Amino acid sequence: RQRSAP
Amino acid sequence: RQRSAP
Amino acid sequence: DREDLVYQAKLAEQAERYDEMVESMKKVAGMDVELTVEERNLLSVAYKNVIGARRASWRIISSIEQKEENKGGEDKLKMIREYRQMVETELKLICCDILDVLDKHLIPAANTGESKVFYYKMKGDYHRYLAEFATGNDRKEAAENSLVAYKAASDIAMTELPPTHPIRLGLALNFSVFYYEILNSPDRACRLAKAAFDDAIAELDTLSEESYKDSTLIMQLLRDNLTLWT
Amino acid sequence: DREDLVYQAKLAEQAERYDEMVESMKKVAGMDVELTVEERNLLSVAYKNVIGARRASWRIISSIEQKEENKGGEDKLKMIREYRQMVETELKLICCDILDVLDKHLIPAANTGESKVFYYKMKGDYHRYLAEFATGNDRKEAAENSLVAYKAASDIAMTELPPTHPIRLGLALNFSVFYYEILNSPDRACRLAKAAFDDAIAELDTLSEESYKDSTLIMQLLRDNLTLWT
Numbered sequence: 001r002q003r004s005a006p
Numbered sequence: 007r008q009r010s011a012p
Numbered sequence: 013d014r015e016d017l018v019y020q021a022k023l024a025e026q027a028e029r030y031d032e033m034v035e036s037m038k039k040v041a042g043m044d045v046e047l048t049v050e051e052r053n054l055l056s057v058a059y060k061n062v063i064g065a066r067r068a069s070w071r072i073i074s075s076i077e078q079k080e081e082n083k084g085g086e087d088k089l090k091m092i093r094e095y096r097q098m099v100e101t102e103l104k105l106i107c108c109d110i111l112d113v114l115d116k117h118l119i120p121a122a123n124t125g126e127s128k129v130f131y132y133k134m135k136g137d138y139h140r141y142l143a144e145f146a147t148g149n150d151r152k153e154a155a156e157n158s159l160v161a162y163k164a165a166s167d168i169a170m171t172e173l174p175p176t177h178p179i180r181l182g183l184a185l186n187f188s189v190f191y192y193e194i195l196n197s198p199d200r201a202c203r204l205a206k207a208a209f210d211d212a213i214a215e216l217d218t219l220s221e222e223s224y225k226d227s228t229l230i231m232q233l234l235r236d237n238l239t240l241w242t
Numbered sequence: 243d244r245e246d247l248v249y250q251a252k253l254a255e256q257a258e259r260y261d262e263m264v265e266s267m268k269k270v271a272g273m274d275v276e277l278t279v280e281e282r283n284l285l286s287v288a289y290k291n292v293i294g295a296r297r298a299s300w301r302i303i304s305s306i307e308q309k310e311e312n313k314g315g316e317d318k319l320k321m322i323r324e325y326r327q328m329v330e331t332e333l334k335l336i337c338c339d340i341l342d343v344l345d346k347h348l349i350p351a352a353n354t355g356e357s358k359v360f361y362y363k364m365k366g367d368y369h370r371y372l373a374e375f376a377t378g379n380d381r382k383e384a385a386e387n388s389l390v391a392y393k394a395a396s397d398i399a400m401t402e403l404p405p406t407h408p409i410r411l412g413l414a415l416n417f418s419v420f421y422y423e424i425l426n427s428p429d430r431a432c433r434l435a436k437a438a439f440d441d442a443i444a445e446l447d448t449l450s451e452e453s454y455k456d457s458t459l460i461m462q463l464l465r466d467n468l469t470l471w472t
Contacts (some may be wrong), residue, residue, distance in 0.1 A: 001470075002419050002423065002470065003419075003463045003466060003467060004415060004416050004419045004463075005411075005412030005413075005415045005416050005460060005463070006290075006412070006456075006459070006460075007240075008192065008193065008237055009185075009189075009233045009236060009237060010137075010185060010189045010233075011181075011182030011183075011185045011230060011233070012060075012182070012226075012229070012230075019318065019321060020325070023303065023306065023321065023322065023325055024325075026302055026303070027299040027302050027303055027325075027329070028295075028298070028299065028302075029299055065258075068258070069257040069258065069259055072256055072257050073253065073256070073257055076253065076256060088249065091246065091249060091250060091253065092253065095253055095254075099257070
């Protein structure tokens with residue numbers, strides 16, 4: 001699962 | 007902290 | 013269509029959309045028939061999450077309010093109090109909602125010992141939630157209604173359910189929390205919680221394959237509260 | 243009153259009532275002035291939680307939909323699809339809300355390199371969220387709008403912010419996710435993410451006391467995605 005920015 | 011039933 | 017509503021409730025639960033879960037399960041309760049164990053539990057879960065979120069919000073906001081009262085933060089306190097009061101309106105509406113469904117639908121249609129104790133216990137619970145934030149006469153009224161409901165549930169429980177039954181044990185746990193937090197009575201709270209625990213220990217052969225993990229958990233919760241209180 | 247709204251936003255955040263948090267921060271954005279770093283971050287947090295809940299719901303419901311498509315569950319699929327479509331309407335409304343605030347209020351009033359890149363990045367993000375569930379022409383449109391926004395943010399970032407700046411790194415991370423998930427382009431995604439990472443490594447002396455933990459975290463997230471993709 002990709003992470004994106006907080 | 008008191009617990010109560012699920 | 014009953015099966016369709018239950019499936020919609022389960023989808024909502026999976027999605028963590030508990031508002032929708034409540035709507036679906038209210039419709040089932042509206043049919044004026046005995047709910048299955050699965051349906052009672054879905055109805056209970058839905059409302060427990062919907063009210064639980066607001067009770068958690070209210071306790072947080074109240075702690076912030078106590079912090080500022082101690083610091084002398086008058087300007088923040090005007091905003092904090094208005095905010096708390098908004099959350100209490102939401103709490104009152106949620107409790108009234110389920111209390112109306114219990115009164116008009118679930119209690120009248122209940123025809124087993126288990127389901128009768130379940131719904132009177134729930135009735136005690138939601139009046140207890142009303143009493144948590146109520147002040148003055150409103151608190152007295154909510155506490156009287158909660159007490160009456162927990163007594164009616166306890167009467168049926170003692171005659172119809174074994175002392176190990178999770179609904180009976182959960183009822184004992186919640187009623188003891190009631191004595192402690194609402195009626196300000198640690199003596200009565202500890203006595204009820206200890207009595208319920210010891211009665212289960214004495215008859216452990218009544219534990220059910222369906223619910224022994226639930227009973228065990230509740231017995232642990234009774235012991236934990238007793239630890240806290242004594 | 244600006245200070246009052248920010249305080250209401252923080253109370254809502256503490257209470258985890260992100261709907262109210264959005265309402266308070268929308269009012270601040272409505273004042274047509276440069277937001278502080280604190281205010282930009284509160285506005286970002288509020289919408290990130292409000293949309294995040296629906297995106298998580300949508301992915302769950304979609305996985306259930308894929309499971310039933312594979313099992314042949316036609317009757318459940320009618321309910322699943324209607325449910326998904328309801329959540330997509332909520333997603334579209336939430337995205338349109340913030341996109342309107344960015345267009346009418348935040349972007350026009352922005353007068354620093356940081357705040358301009360922050361808002362064009364946010365604009366790219368919310369068009370990207372639209373593109374996640376959009377089909378056919380709507381998806382093409384949302385992807386074109388997201389691409390334009392991420393390019394405008396990247397232009398300003400490259401001229402105004404050091405390669406270690408968290409807003410610049412977050413922009414690189416999100417734009418690389420865009421190439422991967424929306425444009426179906428792992429080559430371009432890996433190239434952007436690797437370029438952003440290496441540019442930061444090369445100029446680590448530009449890290450700021452204010453944000454080095456945020457930069458570090460983002461650099462880790464770039465590396466984690468690159469690990470996943472390669």
